[PDB]
Design a protein around this ligand. Structure first.
Ligand SMILES: Cc1cn([C@H]2C[C@H](O)[C@@H](COP(=O)(O)OP(=O)(O)OP(=O)(O)O)O2)c(=O)[nH]c1=O
Ligand SMILES: *P(=O)(O)OC[C@@H]1CC[C@H](n2ccc(N)nc2=O)O1
Ligand SMILES: [Ca+2]
Ligand SMILES: [Ca+2]
Ligand SMILES: [Mg+2]
Ligand SMILES: [Mg+2]
Ligand SMILES: [Mg+2]
Length: 342
DNA sequence: GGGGGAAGGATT
DNA sequence: TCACGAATCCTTCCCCC
């Protein structure tokens, strides 16, 4: 297997540079509000000219402006970013039938049907970079290796506007030398957890008794890290099929009033059924988040598919059960659907 | 004890 | 941002043989 990973560079701000080329080479900051329009918002992303002086993703725009008051600040245009992304993903599909779209700016390709060496993989990567630049004026970073994990790590090491191969020998080296915290799927927790078990590299997981790891981080992760460390990881490039689909919305205030909560619950159902599309669930859960941010949840499985009308009627019954069996005030409410037909 | 299943916490 | 709330793992609890 040869896997190629593509990560679009500083994507939202780069799209703004493409739609207004006069911006290129000057600081550009894309602002995100998350529906909270009474303030200045936050930096969604900034181009490298802005990052150079400390304007980085996540900081409040009021703080960014104290650093670069004369940068160009643009509110997010999510629908445009999504459209440009979708067009680029379509360009990538021409290079492989085996593609996994991981996010709005990330895709994996299994290119094993077209190349079986890294020199030609690199050439294919160059062609992809040129094609996306030609057609959409977007620069990207390409990572190439023997599996998804090292392909992503390769792109992380090479961005922006990069291309990097991690060949078989470099994989072996990284298994010994790469900080296990930089492995995809390992957050701040887990990382600290296995640092307390003496594990700092992928190779270290081979000198623990397995159940000790497993006990700390769980069976799935343990198997994951060990298979990486043994250089046996080979997960296919494929469209991920969800096991559940849902939506949980925040109410304007705490409530324990059924009639007050219902419109929110119904909104969650409508949004969920849009997401479901042609998928038909046989199970429904109602999920309540209490004011202290705990979860209370109740599910039902049917021997048949759930119509939207049954989703409405059953969700109220489940919510009624939640209200009867727990005394806490509810702040967020929604539904999750699972057990899909076919 | 443990098969079976649901609640709901934990993690990315 | 795409990592606020979705999706997924998985421990704990509980029924009851
Ligand atoms: C997109 C995103 C990344 N991160 C983290 C992941 C990293 O630690 C770091 C950057 O990850 P990256 O993957 O490098 O960010 P990105 O490539 O998706 O974004 P951009 O194109 O704008 O440059 O920030 C978030 O916390 N939230 C997010 O929404
Ligand atoms: P991981 O490697 O740290 O993160 C992997 C993916 C990226 C997004 C998604 N994610 C991460 C963190 C949180 N809090 N929520 C998410 O959905 O995991
Ligand atoms: Ca968001
Ligand atoms: Ca419990
Ligand atoms: Mg990117
Ligand atoms: Mg990304
Ligand atoms: Mg990490």
């Amino acid at each position: 297997m040869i896997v190629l990973f593509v990560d679009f560079d500083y994507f939202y701000a780069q799209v703004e540079e493409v739609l207004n080329p006069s911006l290129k080479g000057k600081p550009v900051v894309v602002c995100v509000f998350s529906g909270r329009f009474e303030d200045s918002g936050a930096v969604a992303t900034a181009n490298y000219e802005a990052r150079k002086f400390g304007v980085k993703a996540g900081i409040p725009i009021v703080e960014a402006k104290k650093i670069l008051p004369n940068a160009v600040y643009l509110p997010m245009r999510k629908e445009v970013y999504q459209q440009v992304s979708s067009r680029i993903m379509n360009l990538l599909r021409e290079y492989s039938e085996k593609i996994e779209i991981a996010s709005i700016d990330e895709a994996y390709l299994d290119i094993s049907d077209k190349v079986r060496d890294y020199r030609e993989a690199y050439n294919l990567g160059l062609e992809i970079k040129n094609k996306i630049l030609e057609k959409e004026k977007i620069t990207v970073t390409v990572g190439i290796s023997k599996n998804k994990v090292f392909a992503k790590i390769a792109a992380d090491m090479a961005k922006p506007n990069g291309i990097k191969v991690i060949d078989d020998e470099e994989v072996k080296r990284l298994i010994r030398e790469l900080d296990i915290a930089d492995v995809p799927g390992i957050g701040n927790i887990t990382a600290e957890k296995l640092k307390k078990l003496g594990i700092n590299k992928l190779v270290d997981t081979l000198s623990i008794e397995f159940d000790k790891l497993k006990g700390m981080i769980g069976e799935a992760k343990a198997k994951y890290l060990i298979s990486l460390a043994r250089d046996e990881y080979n997960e296919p490039i494929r469209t991920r099929v969800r096991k559940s689909i849902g939506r949980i919305v925040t109410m304007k205030r705490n409530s324990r009033n059924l009639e007050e909560i219902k419109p929110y619950l119904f909104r969650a159902i409508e949004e969920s059924y849009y997401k479901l599309d042609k998928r038909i669930p046989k199970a429904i859960h109602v999920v309540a988040v209490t004011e202290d941010l705990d979860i209370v949840s109740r599910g039902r499985t049917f021997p048949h598919g759930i119509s939207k009308e049954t989703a409405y009627s059953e969700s109220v019954k489940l919510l009624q059960k939640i209200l009867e069996e727990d005394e806490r005030k509810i702040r967020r409410i929604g539904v999750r659907f699972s057990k899909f037909i076919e």
